[PDB]
Structure 1
Amino acid sequence: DSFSLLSQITPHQRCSFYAQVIKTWYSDKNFTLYVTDYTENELFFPMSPYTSSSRWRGPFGRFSIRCILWDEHDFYCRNYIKEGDYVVMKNVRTKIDHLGYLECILHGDSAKRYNMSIEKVDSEEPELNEIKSRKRLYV
């Protein structure tokens, strides 16, 4: 398989991509990441600069996707992945939420049947060059 820009991903598939973490939120059910590679996708939620919480330190418009982490992915990332980290996510599942918005999911996979993974990427890896250069456009 190959990597995709978040502008290129569609629902009901598996995909891999690099992104930067904007927001994290943990509960006793799952761990949530909001991530962006600063490319636009028509299925992403349009974040309003006029009503979004001042806590939102990410882009506005359809530039961020919500990732739901379950089971081992939750337990592993919930006290590890932080806001601002760069991540690489491999073979995650994409779906449509109830309101038509695209999101991605990391289901528990004890069988290791899908070879999913999420990991931090050092800021200096050239794989992140494109993200950093695109982030310059939106600041």
Structure 2
Amino acid sequence: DSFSLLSQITPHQRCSFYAQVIKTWYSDKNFTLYVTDYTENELFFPMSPYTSSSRWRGPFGRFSIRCILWDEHDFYCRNYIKEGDYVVMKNVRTKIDHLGYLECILHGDSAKRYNMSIEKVDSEEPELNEIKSRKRLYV
């Protein structure tokens, strides 16, 4: 249907959003992104500022969502989407993990049944103006 702020997404729905990539992690099974639009969601994991060792600089608290990418989504993004990039995720699915936190999932879809996509957004696009503005306010 249309785009949501990350504060508006709920579990077990299809949604679309713009976000900034905070963290990436590739593995032999999948590719993981942690993204934010600097809006808070009560089901996101609360990122701690106190962790003894971490390369995460922010945002802290419940402001970012983990996205797991498998199969073609992994192969496409794993050496392409980078920390600090802006992304637009379209028609992606949300779920709740074993511990109750929201996450986003992109399952391999060779049948092309669900129409999902993730693409990089050029940093000058106006749809990113609110993220940039909220980042300033968050900080």
- State the 1:75 CA deviation: 0.3
- CA apart distance, 1:96: 0.1
Whole-angstrom CA distance in 2 between matches of 1:14 and 1:58: 27
CA-based RMSD: 0.9
Aligned residue for 1:7, secondary structure, equals helix
**Per-residue displacement from partner, 1:26-82 (whole Å, max 9, x unpaired)?**
000000000000000000001111116430033001000000000000000000000
1:64-111 deviation per Cα after TM superposition (whole angstroms, max 9, x unaligned): 000000000000000000000000000000000000000000000111
TM-score (norm 1): 0.97
Unaligned stretches of 5+ residues in structure 2: none
Q: Which runs of 4+ in 1 moved over 3 A?
A: none
1:138 is displaced (CA, Å) by 2.0
Q: What is the DSSP-based 3-state SS (H/G/I as helix, E as strand, rest coil) of the residue aligned with 2:7?
A: coil
- 1:111 counterpart residue number: 111
SS in 2 for 1:62: coil
How far did 1:128 drift?
0.3
Match of 2:48 in 1: 48
What is the distance in 1 between the residues matched to 2:126 and 2:119?
Answer: 16
- Rounded Cα–Cα distance in structure 2 between residues aligned with 1:90 and 1:65: 15
TM-score, normalised relative to structure 2:
0.97
Q: Distance between the aligned counterparts of 1:50 and 1:89, measured in 2?
A: 30
Number of aligned residue pairs: 139
- Report the 3-state secondary structure (helix = DSSP H, G, I; strand = E; otherwise coil) of the residue aligned with 1:17: strand
Question: Matches of 1:107 and 1:38 in 2, distance apart?
Answer: 25
Compared CA separation, residues 138 and 23, structure 1 to 2 (3 A): same
Percent sequence identity over aligned pairs: 100
